[PDB]
Amino acid sequence: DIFVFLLSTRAGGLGINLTAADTVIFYDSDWNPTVDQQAMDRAHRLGQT
């Protein structure tokens, strides 16, 4: 059921492994990359199909 999950890149995401997500949206971008790259891959990982 739960359509959408709300996160922060520097706390909500950290290694949290949301394989049930199909898609990712950045409503914000950080002054450093890597945090966004991790934020994507906390969905984009080997547990998806």
Add this chain to the structure above:
DNA sequence: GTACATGCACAGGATGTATATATCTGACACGTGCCTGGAGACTAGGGAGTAATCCCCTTGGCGGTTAAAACGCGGGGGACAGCGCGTACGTGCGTTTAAGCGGTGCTAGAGCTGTCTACGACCAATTGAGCGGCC
């Protein structure tokens, strides 16, 4: 040397009490579990010490005037009788709370949920001191 307050006894009713009885508070023996005595390891502030040096309390001389002690001037505080407004007994009547056994509420506990301030901590911007160039 004095006689009013103390000191001993009578009169007598109540209060200190014994026998007789039923029972709930306290004693006892059990264990849970709360937590305190001991004791360990380390932190790093509190304390003690050496030390410098500054300034208050006591001290001694002195001058002032107030209380003490004495005295004069004179009345209100300690003591007897009447007036009359309260204070202490005793009863009827019953207002009042007792003491009871359930019905229900709200008060208490431990914990949760929600702060939510308020505190370090990390994270990313952006800024001043560091060293070098130029005419």
